Amino acid sequence: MTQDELYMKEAIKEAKKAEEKGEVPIGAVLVINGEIIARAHNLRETEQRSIAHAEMLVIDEACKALGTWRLEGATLYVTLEPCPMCAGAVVLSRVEKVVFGAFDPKGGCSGTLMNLLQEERFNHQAEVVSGVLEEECGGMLSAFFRELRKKK
Amino acid sequence: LYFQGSMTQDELYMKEAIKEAKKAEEKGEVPIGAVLVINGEIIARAHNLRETEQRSIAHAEMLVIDEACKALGTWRLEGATLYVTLEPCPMCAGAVVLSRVEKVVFGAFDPKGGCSGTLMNLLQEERFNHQAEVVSGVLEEECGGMLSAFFRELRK
Ligand SMILES: [Zn+2]
Ligand SMILES: [Zn+2]
């Protein structure tokens, strides 16, 4: 397994902590110079905050852990293609690279509906690597929702 | 028939958002302010705090939206109107869309980064699960005037 896949495995572990809590299993880690300086998972329903996406939590924890808004040199690993809110946060925090697992054909804005991470009219663009452990990351979401309907 | 007059409701709310932007101004931030109203009352008010808190997501719209989510005990801000002095960026427009904020009223356009009309309009995206009603230009001159003052002093 490559370097990106290794770190996506830790984001996947985060995604499973969210499934444990009955959240959509989406996980994220933030890496600078080989160290995971923050990790987080979706908390939208446990905390009832529309903003508690895995990418926003890890970014805010990174900023707080580091005492800076500018996460220069950070790579964000997330199991799913960021939404526009999270893609915006990546741009605003100057994250250098985003690696995601599965594409989000419904709502992804780092390659599918649009690419807010590579918008040249913005003051920052991030490298984007897609499909890293795609089958595991996407299958996790499918099985979560399939298990959800089962509970009726 | 009457001697007195009035502001519209929208510009009364907008001038509370301007008040918040003035606080941001005196702290040396980009002077952007915001209020969130539901059921006819202001539930949350905030201003830009990126430098004060060293958090990239401390935009006025993000703060008031999170405050309202936390206060209301729900991620869904149904019926809410967001007043912000400046056109929302993509992070905040996304957060509007995710929280089902019903309407966004903003003052001045952001020619460089606005994503509620200028570069794009994330608030009126058919392909998203939710669209917000957008009203621009409310107290435009006062809202844009602070930004242009801020960025003129930056140039100098
Ligand atoms: Zn997101
Ligand atoms: Zn913003």
UniProtKB/Swiss-Prot annotation, chain A:
Active site: E55 (proton donor)
Catalytic activity, reaction form: adenosine(34) in tRNA + H2O + H(+) = inosine(34) in tRNA + NH4(+)
Coiled-coil residue spans: none
Residue ranges occupied by any CMP/dCMP-type deaminase domain in the UniProt entry: 2-120
UniProt keyword list: Hydrolase, Metal-binding, tRNA processing, Zinc
Keyword Chloroplast attached: no
EC number: 3.5.4.33
One MF term in the entry's GO annotations: tRNA-specific adenosine-34 deaminase activity
Cofactor dependency: Zn(2+)
CDD domains tied to this protein: nucleoside_deaminase
Transmembrane segments: none
Cofactor, free-text remark: Binds 1 zinc ion per subunit.
Residues annotated for Zn(2+) binding in this entry: H53, C83, C86
Entry-linked Gene3D superfamilies: Cytidine Deaminase, domain 2
HAMAP family: tRNA_aden_deaminase
Name of this chain's protein: tRNA-specific adenosine deaminase
Organism annotation: Bacillus subtilis (strain 168)
Lineage: Bacteria, Bacillati, Bacillota, Bacilli, Bacillales
